[PDB]
Design a protein around this ligand. Sequence first.
Ligand SMILES: Cc1onc(C(=O)O)c1C[C@H](N)C(=O)O
Ligand SMILES: Cc1onc(C(=O)O)c1C[C@H](N)C(=O)O
Ligand SMILES: [Zn+2]
Ligand SMILES: [Zn+2]
Lengths: 258, 258
Amino acid sequence: KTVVVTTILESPYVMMKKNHEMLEGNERYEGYCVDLAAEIAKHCGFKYKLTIVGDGKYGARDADTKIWNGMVGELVYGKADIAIAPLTITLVREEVIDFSKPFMSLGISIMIKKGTPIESAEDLSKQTEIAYGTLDSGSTKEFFRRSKIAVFDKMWTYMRSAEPSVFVRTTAEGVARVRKSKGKYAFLLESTMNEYIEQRKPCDTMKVGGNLDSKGYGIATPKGSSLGNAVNLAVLKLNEQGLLDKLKNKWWYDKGEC
Amino acid sequence: KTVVVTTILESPYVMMKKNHEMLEGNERYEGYCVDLAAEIAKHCGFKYKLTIVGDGKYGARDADTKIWNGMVGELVYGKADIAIAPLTITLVREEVIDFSKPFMSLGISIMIKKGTPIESAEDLSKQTEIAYGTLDSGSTKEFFRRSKIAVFDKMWTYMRSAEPSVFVRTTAEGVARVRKSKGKYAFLLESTMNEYIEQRKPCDTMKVGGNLDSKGYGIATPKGSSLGNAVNLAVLKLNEQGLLDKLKNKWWYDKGEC
Ligand SMILES: Cc1onc(C(=O)O)c1C[C@H](N)C(=O)O
Ligand SMILES: Cc1onc(C(=O)O)c1C[C@H](N)C(=O)O
Ligand SMILES: [Zn+2]
Ligand SMILES: [Zn+2]
């Protein structure tokens, strides 16, 4: 009866409340996706339980086991009823799970420590001094690996065989690496996260150039799930009423520190 | 077995070629959606016939008869198998037809004749010498009618009662009205069209301010159509491969004349 929602601890989408240890259930969490989940559930008429994905991953199929990990895996193997998180709609995922229309629009972007002499993906691909990588088990990494576009293919060829590994387990790891490499490391991540970090202390990173592509986040459900239709219509309704724009302003800029 | 595609004459999505009169069938047309249709048909493996929507409209429901017009209507009443055009994904439409994930992201925008003292929707709403309206039977008009946001709610109350009518039958009429009103008419239309016209002679218009919202265009099919699934996956692949971005650059800026 109670809908099991899988999500991920990724600021500002889902974060632990400062006093979480003294709270119970859903009240332990706060953020863009926590607010969105409450709204979706209310408009669809269901009770739910927020659960943090076990492996803390978004979702990718292991090439040798062919088993899906992350929130995608939670949906595919029946551990969760729905995923409400900054989960990117992609072809490989849409083949195994359903997605509502996008509740957020974004694109792969470049994050640099302020002062880094880099203004585009082309700038990165033509140099070697500054290292650059992406998030593991994410859609950005999958994008580069499967891209036939000149500049991106070249970037992927470098990243896949760069040593030490230029990939990170979480965005927080990528951000920290950018901040500590004194401009010698650039991080490729979605514009949404890039823009968020750019508004947080110590205000030493920035998004440079335009986005490399265009995509969106969607609320996901198991393939053929009955919840799918209601959830999709709810997302459209909430977007048309400006709720999503309000949540973005609330968590990104109203609370900005820079 | 030939798929009947309903579309609309809206540059640069679908336009008649210069020598269209000596051409036949699909060959008569060119544009972003013409190229998209060919790609979709190729990847989904079907032959098709492009047909221009009879009433030249996108799609809205008549409040009294409850009858859908435009391309939406042709899908709903079984006149076309698919709609490949700059058709906006909205709640009221999704309730009667199916939409693929978006192939283009955009938002409502403000078109002004260069020099017009307007920088935002708030500005328009706070004044009256400059009239403004939108396209009839389109998603922008519906947006304003259904929006509960203060500023947009106010703008709607004004447009719905304005006399003469501030509404137009086609974007071409709206653009023409802007160009001939010596700055006394502002046109509310989607950013895609606004940005296109801004790169067209006589280069006397421009998009001002940011978008009023975020939405997307989707390929539409009759609710429950067997084609929906393949088409949706086709759109996702084309976007990930960079084709959609390629077509945008091809029809918007590579051919810009300003
Ligand atoms: C968040 C987030 O921020 N940046 C990324 C990325 O993959 O670069 C992600 C994960 C991505 N949305 C996905 O794999 O769904
Ligand atoms: C194109 C196009 O460009 N501007 C508009 C509009 O409704 O303002 C439209 C129509 C809209 N995409 C729809 O009603 O689907
Ligand atoms: Zn804690
Ligand atoms: Zn192709």
